[PDB]
């Protein structure tokens, strides 16, 4: 290589190089002071200012300090404000600013930086692709979609843009439309396309349209390290946790929880029925595009290890019962919820996001015929007052063809091989 020195900076290259050498040697404190003296003496120097920002960035890593990094993020912007900044340096500085803003979770700030980059460099396709990612991270799929349409209108065979456009189409339930974009994008091999999310959704889109090639893409995703197996396709994993579709209570070790659920199942049922009769707006429809058809809703008591206080007013006895079991109430990668499913419902094959939980089902109102659940290659039925346990990071599928409603209680637990230290530190999902 990059051309980082403007006319004046070439005249002080020896000083600039000496400060950078301290930084590259890991003498971060000395490099900070070296670049501070250069910023003091040469306040308009873009290379000195970038050196200051890079040292602050390194110092933030050493101290693991969000606030030190915020300083670096500001100095990266100061580089761009200076006169006569070389194009290579301007781009490097603002790209790192946006990257570090995302690391901090400042997604709206990163978006502003990315918009500025695209305005400054209107012909850099990769910066537009990065702007689309900025929109995806803040949940603005509509503006992300417009960005990738702009990219594809000029570079129709950009593989990054194809896979991301395909991802957006798939999220919008444009299943058939998504498949060629996801497929061609992965096949491009372009940087950023060899990503578990795109294999996951390409295979899933193919399954939904009945294309038997779906599992070839799962096999390839497994070969490329994205999935533990073709059956277990979660993307947020602790490697090596025992992996099996169906579990017994004894295998989980959570036998006291299972006994409480089975001894007290009727109070849990009765509170669910009272909500169905008198507070039915507490049941919220499934909203993750997982149904082919039918009606399926959940009344959630805990999510991400946090009690919903107003929800627990609707099931106070059940919430009191469950408070005794931190293996589920503290499962920050799971939920506790009632789940009602009505006749005419088919839930598409799907997998959950993480291998870090197991999912218990307590039967509450189970029609004698018509309801079943498949996990991997094995299908089972529920029983009233009895717990089933499976690992929902394995592909699973559900049918409801009874002649009345089916009510279960879903209780997620930490995978039993996770240590207390892991259960305290894993990011919530």
């Amino acid at each position: 290589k990059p051309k980082l020195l403007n006319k004046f900076d070439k005249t002080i290259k020896a000083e600039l190089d000496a400060a950078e050498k301290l930084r590259k040697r890991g003498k971060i404190e000395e490099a900070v002071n070296a670049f501070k003296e250069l910023v003091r003496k040469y306040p308009q120097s873009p290379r000195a200012r970038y050196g200051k920002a890079q040292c602050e960035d390194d110092l933030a890593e050493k101290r693991r300090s969000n606030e030190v990094l915020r300083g670096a993020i500001e100095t990266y912007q100061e580089v761009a404000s200076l006169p006569d900044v070389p194009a290579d340096l301007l781009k490097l500085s603002l790209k790192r600013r946006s990257d570090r803003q995302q690391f901090l979770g400042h997604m709206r700030g990163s978006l502003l930086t990315l918009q500025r980059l695209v305005q400054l460099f209107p012909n850099d396709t990769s910066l537009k692709n990065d702007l689309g990612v900025g929109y995806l991270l803040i949940g603005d799929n509509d503006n992300a979609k417009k960005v990738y349409e702009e990219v594809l209108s000029v570079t129709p065979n950009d593989g990054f843009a194809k896979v991301h456009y395909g991802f957006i189409l798939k999220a919008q339930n444009k299943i058939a439309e998504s498949i060629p974009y996801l497929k061609e994008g992965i096949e491009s091999g372009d940087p950023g396309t060899d990503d578990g999310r795109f294999y996951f959704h390409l295979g899933d889109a193919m399954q939904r349209v009945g294309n038997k090639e779906a599992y070839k893409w799962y096999e390839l995703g497994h070969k490329r390290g994205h999935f533990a197996s073709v059956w277990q396709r979660s993307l947020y994993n602790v490697n090596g946790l025992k992996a099996q579709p169906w579990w017994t209570p004894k295998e989980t070790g959570y036998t006291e929880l299972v006994k409480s659920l089975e001894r007290n199942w009727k109070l849990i049922r009765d509170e669910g029925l009272a909500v169905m009769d008198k507070a039915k707006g507490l049941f919220l429809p499934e909203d993750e595009n997982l149904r082919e058809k039918g009606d399926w809703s959940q009344f959630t008591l805990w999510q991400q290890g946090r009690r919903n206080e107003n929800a627990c007013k609707g099931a106070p006895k059940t919430c009191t019962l469950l408070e005794k079991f931190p293996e589920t109430t503290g499962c920050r990668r799971g939920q506790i919820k009632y789940s009602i499913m009505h006749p005419g419902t088919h839930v598409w094959p799907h997998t959950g996001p993480t291998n870090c939980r197991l999912r218990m089902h307590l039967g509450l109102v189970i029609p004698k015929e018509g309801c079943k659940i498949r996990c991997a290659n094995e299908t089972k039925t529920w029983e009233e007052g009895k717990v089933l346990i499976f690992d929902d990071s394995f592909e699973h599928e559900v049918w409801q063809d009874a002649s009345s409603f089916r009510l279960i209680f879903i209780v997620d637990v930490w995978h039993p091989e996770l240590t207390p230290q892991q259960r305290r530190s894993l990011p919530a999902i």
Binding site: L69, L104, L290
Partner: peptide, 19 residues
């Protein structure tokens, strides 16, 4: 974004908080 409660429908499933 929403949350990945039961699947992998969101672009990312975790919330970033730096260090």
């Amino acid at each position: 974004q929403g949350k990945c409660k039961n699947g992998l429908g969101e672009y990312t499933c975790t919330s970033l908080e730096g260090f």
